[model samples]
Target: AQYEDGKQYTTLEKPVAGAPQVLEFFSFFCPHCYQFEEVLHISDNVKKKLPEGVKMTKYHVNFMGGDLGKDLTQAWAVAMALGVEDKVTVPLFEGVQKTQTIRSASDIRDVFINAGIKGEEYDAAWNSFVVKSLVAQQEKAAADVQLRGVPAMFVNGKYQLNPQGMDTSNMDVFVQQYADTVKYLSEK
Candidate 1:
């Protein structure tokens, strides 16, 4: 392999029960994760150059806190439950990171409303126990993995790779390196 193996990246011993898990550990408030749009460019599908059936999911780092950052995790879970993560995830990041206009749930709702997301789907799925349980399960999984911080990546639940950990010359090179590492671990 051109890149490091599980030594630098990680190898999956307990990969999720599917094709492969390309999990991204992110938080809406994390600027680096926002910028990850340029690195990975995920919305609904293989926005990156990963294999098909890659089973991508953004694991919101539901850190224990009594503040807005923690509150956004619940919102993110709701978006996932509504099956509109591709529709809402980017706006949530842009509203906070780019526009700096979001203040509370209502503001977040406005962001969705502006995106034509106002409907019963959110009402049904947003507060359901399913969403809560999913969020809880996500929290547990991240804890089980002993996540250090946001912007972390886990492939096949066996390997952990941090974007910042890839010491490349620039963003362009880092993208290739990260992509190579992911493609490498995936085929293994």
Candidate 2:
């Protein structure tokens, strides 16, 4: 039930891009996002479920803090630069959810170190100009979308889905959201 069904979503007055883009607004520090990742098995499902031509990306949002704030966000941007976001994201979440002392880049350096990113690959991406640039772009996207919370989905910048109506205890609707996302892209 995409546009037709009762699930509510917002239309972007100024859409995100020229083509279809599915952007999930999130923060590494968000506990519910960490829980949502596990609750909905999003980490395992996204690659398998997303439809073609509908590019999916997870953007980091920081102002709404938990343990690690913009510092962790900086490292995530670095991870994105090194193309290791998929591998490092879980560890970062685990860092926040657990009692891991991830308070700075060096701490995240070790998180990357554990994830097998080290030496120049580590030094290069951490707070580099490119990473900073990506962080700025993500911040702009969050501001552009006027993000509400973690795990919010934006389809082609034309629409934004609010997950308030979704209940993780019952996976049917959560599962259908992805199915409906395909419908959103198919008809666009």
TM-score of each: 0.80, 0.82
Residue 46, candidate 2: how far off, in angstroms? 4.5
Tens-digit lDDT string for candidate 1 (34-127): 8776444533223366776766667788653246676687777887776777778778888888898887877877766777776566656667
lDDT of 2 at 178: 55
* Candidate 1 TM-score, C-alpha based: 0.80
Residue 149 error for model 1, in Å?
Answer: 0.5
CA lDDT of every candidate = 0.69, 0.70
Q: Over 4 Å off in model 1, which ranges? A: 5-20, 38-48, 64-66, 165-168
